[PDB]
Design a protein around this ligand. Structure first.
Ligand SMILES: Nc1ncnc2c1ncn2[C@@H]1O[C@H](COP(=O)(O)OP(=O)(O)OP(=O)(O)O)[C@@H](O)[C@H]1O
Ligand SMILES: Nc1ncnc2c1ncn2[C@@H]1O[C@H](COP(=O)(O)OP(=O)(O)O)[C@@H](O)[C@H]1O
Ligand SMILES: Nc1ncnc2c1ncn2[C@@H]1O[C@H](COP(=O)(O)OP(=O)(O)O)[C@@H](O)[C@H]1O
Ligand SMILES: Nc1ncnc2c1ncn2[C@@H]1O[C@H](COP(=O)(O)OP(=O)(O)O)[C@@H](O)[C@H]1O
Ligand SMILES: [Mg+2]
Ligand SMILES: [Mg+2]
Lengths: 80, 1622, 193
């Protein structure tokens, strides 16, 4: 379909822009005492989690746009 | 032998026990001493059970059993008598003390005299013989008491008009419910029962003080014991009327406070204008006067001193006596601080803290005045402050004190407030005071707005308490309508009280506009009250409220509180907002609050502590992980500061005790100096904030504690006494206990954290994932506290979302304005009344369920410091100190900040409940609890030993479980669902061994045999419990991984997966294929609904369901529609004869009512000593509730399905509550089976994890092509036995049928159209259609067989198509499939495009020519016009096809039609024509503008009666326009699927229907007498005599909506897409 | 006769008031009628088949909500009430709303204070148009704030000036007006530092 092909290009192009890796900060006995590390560990943890979700969602979207996987209730809402 | 003596002791007690009778006004001898009577019965009942435990119970069993019957009767009789006697007491005082009621209400005054005369008769009989057993032996005494109770309720309910009039006499009665008001009026003579009601009518008066005659009121008392002695005592003898002397008491209360204030002002003038103050003199003054008076007098003295000083500086160049005012405040504050440092009586301590709070504010104000160089008393920097002026020369004592702020002047109301917790006067508080007082001067309301926990509600009360006003807090919701809010205004206006309405935007917008008229009308009365022209000697100011003239007191005020940032809240109309003055309170001055609170509590380093504790809360908010259950606001800071004072007091008491027991040297100064205030604050912080923290945040907070508070460590106390109690309780409850790092130490720590939170907060939340040990924690704690403190613990568990909000809190009748209690309201009110000693017990109300703002925001004032349950009828219920409100939840993603802030939080994690402890609990129960109710227990013990090596840390089960979470399941996988599935199956294995031993009494199973069976069974159980909700590939995956890890012998097949093997009782593996044979079905049973062709998947699922169903464990069948879920359960239920199954068809609109309607039909409610028990009417039968669309019910905006919560409550707790009497009902012999499609399907929602924990799920996928060949090749082989010439074509015919079904299923999917569902149901209909045509046919050439095969396929796969392209595909693909599997046949003869079949031109169903069919229909249509409907119709080819399709379904049992097409296409007319042709009677409902659901039920009853009792074939034609509500489709859905509506016939309608069914069955010649067989015959008749034709337009979104609203419309109805004319 | 829409009893009052007024010629005002779109369709039908008194008037106050029936909008004459377009329009509306006899009281300085009141009010609302820069959010600075401001000026001017014809500007309670306006009248709605 027209929108099915249109969403495929956008999802694939979007996957190119977004990065792929983001490693969590490492806990250390003296790192905890640093407030800067205390704040930054939350930043990467939120970033790495959200990065994994969005990319996986787009991945599923491209899979639907190629017909490899069936549409689900959440996937229908996300694609809509 | 000691059993006999205990029986003799109990016999002697009851033969000597007599009812303690005391005279009541020389009218009767009322029963006294209920508590001793009830306790003795309870003690003997528990003893009666103990003797049964011993094996010697048998010799005295009959006598013991006869005894327990008598005590139960005693308990039953006296559980009503106490209610009857109490009801009669206050009803007697109303019909006798008052004279106006006899003229006003004469009819039931005589009714009361009749029942009363019966009561005195009964009482005199009890008097003659006061023996308890003799009273029990009175004939019909139980029935008589219940009749007395029922009648007294009717008279009591019929006193509403009298109560409304009495409220006008004494205005404060408007804040007392009807139940308590009757008690107050009736018990006017005996004042001792009035003491518990004064708290509801006064701000700080909890009890009154009387002389020893109880005839003169000497004064009042508060809940803290503070007393005010009246200067003029009120004598009740002179004013016998209750409303008369209550007014005098209220009037005297104000006067005596004003006169005491004048005395205190004169006394405090000495402390003012004094350079040095003696602490002993100041302390004596403080103790002499009440708490609110000492603060007021200090306020007056400071105000006059500043006014005097500013007058001296009025010349400008004069000196500065303002410094003398500052020094006097500082000198007084130093004495105040010194007094707090030393120990003080609790009442004097609270007075000192209030005085400290006031003088800190005075010092700050005076310093500001000096810093501003103020020299004039008329400067606004002094006038903007709140100043207190006293005029002793004024004759009116109530007018001697004036409160002024800016231009606003107020008179002290002199309402006694007791000892209220004062607020720190922050700059935001001053801005609030300035703005609210300006609103009061403008005769306008106040609207402090902002986020939660900013001090808005307390600010209104604090200002009202400062003016001596009675402030009433109302927690408003959507039920606060025009009438309820208007009645609240009437009470406030007449009393002269402040009404603070918090969450006032929770009202409906239409209601908000409506109340603006009343607020505006009230303010105009207030505005005209303030004009000097008005004189109080004239007519008092009245306003128009609820069509009544209501007096308005000048002390009345209205304040509203809202959070305008909450999404989903009503927007106030502008004409309402202009009636109020709004102020933003967003950033409370926490630092000043913390500093003043710690300074008043006795901390020397308060300033350092405050500067450390306020940033720490900010640090925790921004450095800890963001969790929805985290709150670090002012309310959290308020709790820790209060607990810090409590801890410091406890520590000081501890050090003094240590000094006392170690020598004799005690000094307050030494202890205060050498006291670790840093550790006290840290301990308070951790005790409140640690339990809510997640595991990752615990080091995070303890690290932050090191930077802000270096050097101080938290060492939690070792609660040795409580831990021992916990260990004993856990041992008896089969729960694992550990200390610290042992298995279960984290869970024990969570329980201890829960205990600590109970002591600080009255509101608690256990938050954690499903199966985290939350419920087991508080159950064990409740028992342990019972065994330790000796206080009996009672737990009331409520599922708030399993019922409606009306049923949870109560409903106000819009017509009669009568209040009925809800579930939570009834429990709370019963505890408050404490008729059966509920206040001496620990009452816990656990809200186990989902939390959303709609229902829990009603508890805001309950969980605040107000501790009030406000109801829309003006009633306020106080939370007793022994009651805890608990919320056991799995998430808080929908709760708001208001709810989270008000509750203490304990966070539970899946880590807290280690898999090891679950294994230990299962094994401990197996070794202890026999499975019969022991040889079985012995088998269980040997079995438990065998599985012990596998139920270990990182054991086979653990490793398998870990690997299982990495696979994909049709439902979300949780640990406890899988393990509960595993444990139930292992119970079956033990029951299996018992069966073998019973079947082999000579040779029972050996240990080696048991070991082999258990080992193989365990692997078999692990696979099906951990991969039953997965497809075939992951079942293979789990089997492969288990083969990699296990040491148990496994089948040695090179490629067959382990899931294809069962475990024989022989202890050896046996393939499932040995139980699935190639059976040959009879000719007359071909593709019958109850005929199942065994396959590999069928036998595996059947044996699985038998294992789960037997254990009575609820289960869920998941899979695509038509996969065989319903077929498998009924086939598995066959092996369960004692189990009776009832089918319920869930829809989007399904509520727990459908569950309740089924219960009212198939079950009965039986009252027992234990309680109300709901059990099936059939005896020795287990009712199986089969719900077909469990995941279909609608989810609200907060992710909850009400019926799913209802079922979850019914399974987890074993019962539910009856909204009729808030009575707990316990289920018996009732099991539950669920069926559903995968949650990813449209319209389906994922089931809650808490529900799924109790229900194992097995995935039933579509049979494979190999399975389809076997299931339908057998049917064809039997079907084709009718004509032997076609028997050789059985194999190719099945192949063609299998192939076309696969292509149709692959080509058309739900993506294209919502109704494009293809399943083996179509393949079953395919075989039925061919068989039905072939039955009469004596012989048929192969060409005719293909024509029938092609025809049925066109009817099953093409009739539902929407686009012509799809239909063309079906036609062509059918041509190709038939030629692919049937070569060398006459293509044209067997596949002529007009494939038409009919039984109209002959007796048999044979192919019909188009032109002959057209002529015959023309002739029939001619008769149709002259007989039924004279509407000429033009006949075209599509019409001929349609009338043949309609004729096909009308000839089928339970055949229903869904005709989809454009309006006016002929659907209704054609259906009427075919129905007339087949003899069916057309029924259509006549919808008008007033047609409601009750009309539809009556219309339905007409169809059911005619088609079920009269054996009349009826075609029920219904159009989508006939549907006016979702109620229409809910009954239609049930009727289409089951053929009967559960709640359609009730009362006399059911009685009449059974009579007609008996008459109808007699006509048929059948002998049915009982009701259940009459209904079953009635159901069978309707299923065979009713044809429902649904007609709707081809809407795109409407079709998708209907696929969930009415699932039966797409599963039980044949869909025919007429569409538009081509 | 003014009735607030939203309750079952209110509809009964509205119907009774309209029936009485169309014969007697009184004025009926129904407020927040946008909260009952269904009843509005019934009311428009009742109005169409009616021959009221010559002096009868029916005023329906409502927000600009799409739920208002179209037929009612076509049946009636629509007047839009919104912030005045500019400072001059804002000040002209204020001077029209305040009665002349109130401004022209004994102190000759009252007229100037009312003008600074109109100018302050006009500047404040016109800044609301520029949502991020003029203020931080759409504060509801409206007629209620202006009326409360006018009452406050009247109260404190009469307090300081005891019926005198002229008061020197130094004795005007500037601090009282400024503080009450920044903390209570206009500052009450302000929740931003
Ligand atoms: N300390 C323990 N030792 C052993 N078994 C335990 C312990 N605590 C709980 N269990 C068992 O583990 C399971 C946990 O159920 P429980 O009701 O305690 O969990 P929950 O967190 O309240 O669940 P939900 O959120 O689903 O209501 C139960 O079978 C219970 O008997
Ligand atoms: N000025 C203050 N001094 C002392 N405590 C305060 C002050 N302001 C607020 N609090 C405390 O904050 C808590 C929450 O305030 P609350 O009345 O719930 O505000 P809201 O109306 O915004 O919910 C109260 O328990 C109160 O004791
Ligand atoms: N082994 C089998 N033997 C006989 N019929 C089967 C078998 N497997 C599937 N079927 C057919 O599949 C259909 C399943 O329909 P149903 O029980 O309503 O499934 P669900 O409950 O999943 O919707 C039945 O009509 C049945 O004839
Ligand atoms: N085959 C037909 N020939 C002539 N008139 C028809 C035909 N089908 C429907 N009609 C017209 O439709 C009217 C009846 O409406 P109906 O077709 O029953 O509505 P619906 O198709 O929505 O059920 C009749 O007045 C009749 O004139
Ligand atoms: Mg509040
Ligand atoms: Mg639980």
């Amino acid at each position: 379909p027209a929108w099915m092909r249109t969403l495929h290009t956008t999802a694939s192009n979007w996957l190119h822009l977004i990065p792929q890796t983001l490693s969590h900060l490492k806990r250390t006995v003296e790192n905890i005492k640093d407030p800067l590390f205390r704040f930054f560990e939350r930043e990467v943890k939120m970033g790495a989690k959200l990065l994994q979700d969005v990319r996986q969602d787009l991945a599923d979207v491209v899979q639907v746009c190629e017909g490899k996987k069936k549409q689900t209730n959440y996937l229908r809402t996300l694609i809509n | 032998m000691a059993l006999e003596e205990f029986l003799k002791q109990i016999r002697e007690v009851w033969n000597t026990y007599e009812l303690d009778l005391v005279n009541y006004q020389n009218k009767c001898r009322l029963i006294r001493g209920w508590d001793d009577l009830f306790n003795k019965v309870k003690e003997h009942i528990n003893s009666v059970s103990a003797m049964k435990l011993s094996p010697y119970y048998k010799v005295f069993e009959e006598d013991a059993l006869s005894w327990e019957d008598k005590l139960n009767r005693i308990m039953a009789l006296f559980d009503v008598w106490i209610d009857v006697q109490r009801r009669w007491v206050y009803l007697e005082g109303i019909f006798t003390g008052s004279a106006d009621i006899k003229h006003l209400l004469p009819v039931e005054t005589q009714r009361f005299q009749s029942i009363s005369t019966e009561f005195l008769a009964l009482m005199k009989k009890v008097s003659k013989s006061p023996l308890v057993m003799d009273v029990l032996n009175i004939q019909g005494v139980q029935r008589s008491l219940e009749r007395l109770a029922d009648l007294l309720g009717k008279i009591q309910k019929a006193l509403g008009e009298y109560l409304e009039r009495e409220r006008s006499s004494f205005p404060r009665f408007y804040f007392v419910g009807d139940e308590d008001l009757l008690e107050i009026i009736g018990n006017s003579k005996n004042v001792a029962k009035l003491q518990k009601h004064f708290k509801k009518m006064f701000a700080g008066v909890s009890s009154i003080i009387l002389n020893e005659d109880n005839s003169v009121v000497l004064g009042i008392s508060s809940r803290e014991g503070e007393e005010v002695m009246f200067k003029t005592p009120v004598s009740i003898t002179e004013h016998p009327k209750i409303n008369e002397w209550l007014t005098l008491v209220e009037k005297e209360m104000r006067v005596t406070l004003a006169k005491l204030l004048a005395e205190s002002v004169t006394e405090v003038e000495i402390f003012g204008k004094a350079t040095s103050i003696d602490p002993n003199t100041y302390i004596t003054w403080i103790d002499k006067y009440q708490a609110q008076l000492v603060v007021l007098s200090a306020q007056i003295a400071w105000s006059e001193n500043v006014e005097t000083a500013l007058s001296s500086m009025g010349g400008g160049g004069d000196a500065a006596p303002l410094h003398s005012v500052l020094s006097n405040v500082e000198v007084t504050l130093n004495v105040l601080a010194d007094s707090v440092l030393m120990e003080q009586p609790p009442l004097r301590r609270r007075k000192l803290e209030h005085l400290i709070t006031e003088l800190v504010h005075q010092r700050d104000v005076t310093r500001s005045l000096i810093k501003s160089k103020i020299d004039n008393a008329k400067s606004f920097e002094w006038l903007s402050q709140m100043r207190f002026y006293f005029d002793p020369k004024q004759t009116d004592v109530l007018q001697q004190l004036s409160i002024q702020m800016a231009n606003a002047k107020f008179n002290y109301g002199f309402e006694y407030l007791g000892v209220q917790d004062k607020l720190v006067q922050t700059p935001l508080t001053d801005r609030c005071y300035l703005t609210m007082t300006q609103a009061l001067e403008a005769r306008l309301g106040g609207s402090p707005f902002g986020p939660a926990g900013t001090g808005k509600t307390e600010s209104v009360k604090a200002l009202g308490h400062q003016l001596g006003r009675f402030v009433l807090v109302f927690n408003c919701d959507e039920t606060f309508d025009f009438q309820a809010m208007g009645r609240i205004f009437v009470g406030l206006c007449q009393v002269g009280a402040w009404g603070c309405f918090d969450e006032f935007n929770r009202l409906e917008e239409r209601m908000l506009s409506a109340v603006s008229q009343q607020v505006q009308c009230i303010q105009e009365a207030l505005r005209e009250h303030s004009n000097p022209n008005y004189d109080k000697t004239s007519a008092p100011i009245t306003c128009e409220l609820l069509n009544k003239q209501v007096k308005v007191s000048p002390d009345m005020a209205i304040f509203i509180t809202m959070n305008p940032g909450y999404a989903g809240r009503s927007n106030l109309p502008d004409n309402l907002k202009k009636l109020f003055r709004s102020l933003a309170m967003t950033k409370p001055d926490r630092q000043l609050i913390a500093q003043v609170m710690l300074y008043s509590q006795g901390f020397r380093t308060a300033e350092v502590l405050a500067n450390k504790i306020v940033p720490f809360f900010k640090l925790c908010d921004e450095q800890l992980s963001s969790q929805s259950h985290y709150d670090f606001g002012l309310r959290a800071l308020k709790s820790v500061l209060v607990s810090a004072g409590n801890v410091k007091r406890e520590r000081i008491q501890k050090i003094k005790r240590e000094k006392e027991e170690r020598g004799e040297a005690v000094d307050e100064g030494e202890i205060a100096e050498n006291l670790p205030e840093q550790e006290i604050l840290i301990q308070s912080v951790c005790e409140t904030m640690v339990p809510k923290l997640v595991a990752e945040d615990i080091p995070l907070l303890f690290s932050l504690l090191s930077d802000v508070f270096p050097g101080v460590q938290y060492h939690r106390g070792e609660m040795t006494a409580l831990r021992e109690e916990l260990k004993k309780v856990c041992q008896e409850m089969y729960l694992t206990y550990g200390d610290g790092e042992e298995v279960g130490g984290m869970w024990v720590e969570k329980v201890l954290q829960l205990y600590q939170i109970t002591q600080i907060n009255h509101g608690l939340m256990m938050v954690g994932p499903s199966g985290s040990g939350k419920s087991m924690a508080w159950r064990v704690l409740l028992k342990a506290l019972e065994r330790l403190e000796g206080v009996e613990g009672v737990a009331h568990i409520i599922d708030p979302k399993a019922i409606s909000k009306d049923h949870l809190y109560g409903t106000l009748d819009p017509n009669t304005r009568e209040w009925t209690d809800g579930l939570f309201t009834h429990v709370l009110r019963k505890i408050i009344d404490s008729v059966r000693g509920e206040l001496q017990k620990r009452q816990w109300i656990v809200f186990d369920g989902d939390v959303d703002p709609e229902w829990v925001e009603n508890l805001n004032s309950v969980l605040d410091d107000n501790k009030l349950l406000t109801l829309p009828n003006g009633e306020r219920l106080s939370l007793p100190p022994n009651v805890r409100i608990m919320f056991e939840v799995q998430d808080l993603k929908y709760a708001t900040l208001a709810t989270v802030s008000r509750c203490g939080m304990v966070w539970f994690s899946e880590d807290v409940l280690s898999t090891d402890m679950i294994f230990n609990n299962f094994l401990a129960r197996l070794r202890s609890i026999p499975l019969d109710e022991s040889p079985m227990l012995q088998i269980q013990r040997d079995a438990a030993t065998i599985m012990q090596p596998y139920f270990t840390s990182n054991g086979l089960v653990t490793k398998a479980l870990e690997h299982a979470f990495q696979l994909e399941h049709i439902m979300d996988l949780t640990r406890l669902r899988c393990l509960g599935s595993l444990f139930s199956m292992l119970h079956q294995a033990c029951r299996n061994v018992a069966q073998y031993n019973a079947n082999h009494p000579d040779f029972p199973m050996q240990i080696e045999q048991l070991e082999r069976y258990i080992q193989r069974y365990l692997v078999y159980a692990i696979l099906w419990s951990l991969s039953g909700d997965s497809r075939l590939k992951m079942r293979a995956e789990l089997g492969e991984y288990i083969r990699r890890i296990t040491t148990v012998p496994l089948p040695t097949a090179p490629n067959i997966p382990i899931i294809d093997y069962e475990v024989s009782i022989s202890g050896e593996w046996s393939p499932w294929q040995a139980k699935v044979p190639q059976i040959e079905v009879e000719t007359h049973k071909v593709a019958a609904p109850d005929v199942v062709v065994p396959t590999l998947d069928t036998v595996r699922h059947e044996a699985l369901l038998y294992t789960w169903l037997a254990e009575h464990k609820p289960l869920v069948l998941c899979g695509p529609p038509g996969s065989g879920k319903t077929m498998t359960l009924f086939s598995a239920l066959r092996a369960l004869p004692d189990m009776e199954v009832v089918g319920l068809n869930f829809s989007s609109a399904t509520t727990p009512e459908l569950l309740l309607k089924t219960f009212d039909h198939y079950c009965e409610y039986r009252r027992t000593p234990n309680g109300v028990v709901l059990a099936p009417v059939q005896l020795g039968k287990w009712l199986v509730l089969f719900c077909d669309e469990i995941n279909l019910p609608d989810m609200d905006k907060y992710g909850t399905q009400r019926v799913i919560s209802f079922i979850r409550q019914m399974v987890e707790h074993g019962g539910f509550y009856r909204t009729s009497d808030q009575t707990w009902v316990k289920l018996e012999r009732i099991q539950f089976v669920g069926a559903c499609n995968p949650p990813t399907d449209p319209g389906r929602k994922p089931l809650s994890h808490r529900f799924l924990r109790h229900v194992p799920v097995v995935y039933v996928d579509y049979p494979g092509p190999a399975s389809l060949t076997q299931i339908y090749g057998t049917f064809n082989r039997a079907m084709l036995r009718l004509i032997p010439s076609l028997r050789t074509y059985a194999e190719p015919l099945t192949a063609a049928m299998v192939e076309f079904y696969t292509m149709s299923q692959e080509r058309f999917t739900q993506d294209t159209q919502p109704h494009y569902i293809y399943s083996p149901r179509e393949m079953t209909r395919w075989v039925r259609g061919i068989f039905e045509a072939l039955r009469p046919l004596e012989t048929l050439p192969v060409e005719g067989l293909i024509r029938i095969w092609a025809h049925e396929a066109l009817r099953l796969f093409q009739d539902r198509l929407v686009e012509d392209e799809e239909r063309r595909w079906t036609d062509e693909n059918i041509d190709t499939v038939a030629l692919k599997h049937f070569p060398n046949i006459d293509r044209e003869k067997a596949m002529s495009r007009p494939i038409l079949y009919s039984n109209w031109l002959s007796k048999d169903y044979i192919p019909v020519d188009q032109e002959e069919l057209r002529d015959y229909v023309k002739a029939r249509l001619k008769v149709f016009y002259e007989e039924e409907l004279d509407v000429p119709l033009v006949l075209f080819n599509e019409v001929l096809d349609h009338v043949l399709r309609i004729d096909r379904i009308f000839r089928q049992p339970q055949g229903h039609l869904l005709l989809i097409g454009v309006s006016g296409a002929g659907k209704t007319t054609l259906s009427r024509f075919v129905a007339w042709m087949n003899g069916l009677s057309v029924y259509q409902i006549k919808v008008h503008r007033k047609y409601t659901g009750e009309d539809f039920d009556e219309d339905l009853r007409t169809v059911l009666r005619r088609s079920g009792c009269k054996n009349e074939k009826i075609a029920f034609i219904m159009d989508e326009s006939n549907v006016l509500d979702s109620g229409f489709l809910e009954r239609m859905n049930t009727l289409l699927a089951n053929g009967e509506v559960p709640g359609l016939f009730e009362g006399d309608e059911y009685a009449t229907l059974m009579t007609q069914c008996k008459e109808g069955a007699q006509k048929e010649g059948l002998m049915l007498d009982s009701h259940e067989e009459l209904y079953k015959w009635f159901t069978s008749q309707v299923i065979r005599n009713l044809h429902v034709v649904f007609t709707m337009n081809p809407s795109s979104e409407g079709l998708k909506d209907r696929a969930a609203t009415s699932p039966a419309l797409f599963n039980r109805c044949v869909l025919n897409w007429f569409g538009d004319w081509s | 006769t003014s009735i607030a829409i939203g309750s079952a009893e209110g509809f009964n009052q509205a119907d009774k008031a309209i029936n009485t007024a169309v014969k007697s010629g009184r004025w009926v005002m129904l407020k927040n009628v946008h909260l009952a779109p269904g009843w509005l369709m019934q009311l428009e039908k009742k109005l169409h088949s009616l021959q009221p008194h010559a002096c009868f008037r029916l005023f329906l106050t409502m927000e600009i909500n799409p739920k208002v029936p179209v037929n009612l909008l076509r049946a009636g004459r629509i007047f839009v009430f919104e912030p005045p377009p500019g400072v001059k329009a804002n000040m002209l509306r204020t001077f029209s709303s305040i009665p002349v006899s109130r401004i022209c009281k004994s102190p000759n300085e009252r007229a100037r204070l009312y003008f600074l009141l109109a100018w302050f009010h006009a500047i404040i609302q016109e800044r609301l148009r520029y949502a991020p820069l003029g203020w931080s959010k759409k504060y509801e600075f409206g007629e209620s704030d202006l009326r409360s401001a006018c009452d406050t000026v009247d109260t404190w001017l009469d307090d300081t000036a005891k019926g005198r014809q002229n008061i020197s500007p130094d004795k005007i309670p500037w601090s009282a007006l400024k503080t009450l306006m920044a903390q209570s009248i206009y500052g009450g709605r302000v929740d931003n530092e």
